[PDB]
Nucleic acid binder design. Structure first.
Lengths: 99, 68, 49, 76, 349
RNA sequence: GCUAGGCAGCUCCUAGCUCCUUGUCUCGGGGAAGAGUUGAGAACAAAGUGGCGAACGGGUGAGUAAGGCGUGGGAAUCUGCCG
């Protein structure tokens, strides 16, 4: 089962994930089929947000039948190609800011 | 109702019930409060974990405690 | 898209559960079908090339 | 503490031709075709016909299920 | 408790002192929280021994209040004889209505009236005729208006409540009528019938429909309630307006039902608010009512309020649990109240 | 309050959502504690039987001088899970 997934890729205490079409029983960092771009999970300064993904091949691997994991849905819906997570139910109440 | 809701979340917070009681105290303030808030209270990590766990569960309604 | 309002009544999560099962499965299946046909379209284009 | 065989074997001729349903849905039921018991009167496989709210709708012998789940009561 | 009704009552019985037995039966009715099958049996024996038919009748009425008085056949012939040999016509008719709701009994009415001749109680004989009519279980509008004019001549609510129970139990009372309701309301206006006409006018004018329940009709039942001049009756008018929807809108409804009345009244105010709102849309306004109690703290009033709300069995059982586990209550309420909250969890959950 | 079901000659009483039988003791022909088994509320319980995984993921480099490794292939095969 090709699990299109996200492996850690960076220095300690400030990581950087990466999108790769793996095999299930391969290590986290193990033998990948191919990376698929990137996804920096750190908030930035140009647009103070996060970045990163690739397209045009996730189509092919979804078509040939990858069952990935939901921490990847958190991107493959935020950029289309999927439906939203069927666990977007509610939201914490009481966020407060003063700066 | 801090006493029943809590003695429903379990006999692990057998003191954190009262540590929430003597101080401000509230049932929905629990749902809306957060991590460092509850940690300032000296409550250990697994207690905090079960607290927010069952609290999300009730905010959804799947908890609904009853002394059984 | 709105996919909210899962917890409504005491202890009947089967609402969003039915959501999950049929909604999400059929969603993804549909998407996948699309992908199959469109990508094989691309292939036949490459052959015509 | 009663089962499907526990409620059937009461009936004479093994009570082979009556309905039975789940007592909280007056909307469906399955009939008995014929019982085939294992041993010592607690276990038995069979077929039946569907009777939704007493309306027959099934056509061929289809297995009856839950025949070992300990929750049953008869149909009257 | 009834552990206590079975405690020190063995000493009451076998104390060799009818004085001890009488004092202890008074003590048990003073602790006032015990009435069961044990109460009926032990009190029967100890009272037939101690010769205090007054305390006997009191314990028998309490046994009908919290034990089987109409279970299967529930005959009490010598027990009714004692309940009327207390000479209290009131308790006589009470035990009479108990055995009547069990099954047919005319010696019930006869002992009630003999105790009436013993105690000189017009209201008590009125209530005994009430039990008679209710156990007869039949109703008609001609004799209903005649009895309304009779209770009018007496100028009291007693026989009016007699006829009220008679009709609204016999279930052939108005037969979906409006001008006939007007004729019976004229029979009641011949009394001016403050409390009875207020409450029953609310019920009739707001039950299901005559033409349409409007602002005029709702405020009119409220005007009759005002002229009735009773606080619990004001709560009764509020509760009937809650059984019905309202007059104008929900905002005005809440801002009117947010005027707390005195004791015995705010209880049904908050309870009816909870039950009605949960019936209309949700227990949202019932939670607003728990907020009203958690602000103002009408202790025994809101206590019986939340207890009636617990017996109302809405869809928020554990929610009333997490709303009442931190609360107050008066004596002899909280046990049955929270056990019935978990019982509402046994209704829904 | 409103509706579907046994009890003993449409009525007299048992179970449901809106908003329990019989026998001893004792009370009054029906109730009062009382044993035992029909009518339901749930918990893993020993485990087991089982299904799955413990063959992955970790550790070492004695051995192996190429039956290995890299690189490029192929047919004579299989490929739980995924689609």
């Amino acid at each position: 089962v090709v699990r299109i997934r996200l492996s850690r890729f960076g220095c300690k205490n400030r990581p950087f994930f990466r999108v790769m079409a793996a095999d299930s029983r391969s290590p986290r960092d193990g033998k990948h089929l191919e990376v698929l771009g990137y996804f920096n999970p750190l908030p930035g300064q140009d647009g103070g947000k996060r970045m990163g993904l690739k397209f045009d091949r996730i189509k092919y691997w979804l078509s040939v039948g990858a069952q990935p994991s939901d921490p990847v849905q958190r991107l493959l819906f935020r950029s289309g190609l999927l439906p939203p997570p069927p666990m977007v139910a509610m939201g914490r109440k009481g966020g407060a800011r003063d700066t | 109702g801090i006493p029943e809701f809590l003695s429903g979340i379990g006999g692990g917070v057998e003191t954190h019930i009262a540590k929430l009681e003597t101080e401000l105290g509230d049932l929905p303030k629990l749902l809306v409060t957060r991590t460092l808030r509850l940690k300032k209270f000296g409550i250990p990590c697994k207690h905090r974990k079960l607290i927010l766990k069952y609290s999300h569960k009730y905010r959804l309604g799947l908890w609904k405690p009853r002394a059984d | 898209i709105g996919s909210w309002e899962a917890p409504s009544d005491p202890k009947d999560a089967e609402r969003k559960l039915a959501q999950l099962r049929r909604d999400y499965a059929k969603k993804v299946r549909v998407y996948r079908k699309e992908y199959i046909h469109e990508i094989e379209m691309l292939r036949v284009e490459k052959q015509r090339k | 503490k009663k089962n499907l065989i526990e409620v059937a074997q009461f009936l004479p001729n093994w009570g082979i031709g009556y309905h039975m349903a789940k007592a909280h849905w007056n909307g469906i039921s399955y009939e008995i075709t014929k019982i085939n018991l294992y041993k010592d009167g607690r276990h038995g496989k069979a077929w039946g016909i569907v009777h939704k709210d007493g309306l027959r709708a099934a056509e061929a012998p289809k297995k009856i299920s839950g025949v070992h789940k300990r929750c049953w009561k008869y149909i009257p | 408790a009834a552990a206590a009704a079975a405690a020190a009552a063995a000493a009451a019985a076998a104390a060799a002192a009818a004085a001890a037995a009488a004092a202890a039966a008074a003590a048990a009715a003073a602790a006032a929280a015990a009435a069961a099958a044990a109460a009926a049996a032990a009190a029967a024996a100890a009272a037939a021994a101690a010769a205090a038919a007054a305390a006997a009748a009191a314990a028998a009425a309490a046994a009908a209040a919290a034990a089987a008085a109409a279970a299967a056949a529930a005959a009490a012939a010598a027990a009714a004889a004692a309940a009327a040999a207390a000479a209290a016509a009131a308790a006589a008719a009470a035990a009479a209505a108990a055995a009547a709701a069990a099954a047919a009994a005319a010696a019930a009415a006869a002992a009630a009236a003999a105790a009436a001749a013993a105690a000189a109680a017009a209201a008590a004989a009125a209530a005994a005729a009430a039990a008679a009519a209710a156990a007869a279980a039949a109703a008609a509008a001609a004799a209903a208006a005649a009895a309304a004019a009779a209770a009018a001549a007496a100028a009291a609510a007693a026989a009016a409540a007699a006829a009220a129970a008679a009709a609204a139990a016999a279930a052939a009372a108005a037969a979906a009528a409006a001008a006939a309701a007007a004729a019976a309301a004229a029979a009641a206006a011949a009394a001016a019938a403050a409390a009875a006409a207020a409450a029953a006018a609310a019920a009739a004018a707001a039950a299901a429909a005559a033409a349409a329940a409007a602002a005029a009709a709702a405020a009119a039942a409220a005007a009759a309630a005002a002229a009735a001049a009773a606080a619990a009756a004001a709560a009764a008018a509020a509760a009937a307006a809650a059984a019905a929807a309202a007059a104008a809108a929900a905002a005005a409804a809440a801002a009117a039902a947010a005027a707390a009345a005195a004791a015995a009244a705010a209880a049904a105010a908050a309870a009816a608010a909870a039950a009605a709102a949960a019936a209309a849309a949700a227990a949202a306004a019932a939670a607003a009512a728990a907020a009203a109690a958690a602000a103002a703290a009408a202790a025994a009033a809101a206590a019986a309020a939340a207890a009636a709300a617990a017996a109302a069995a809405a869809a928020a059982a554990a929610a009333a649990a997490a709303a009442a586990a931190a609360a107050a209550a008066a004596a002899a309420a909280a046990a049955a109240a929270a056990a019935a909250a978990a019982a509402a969890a046994a209704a829904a959950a």
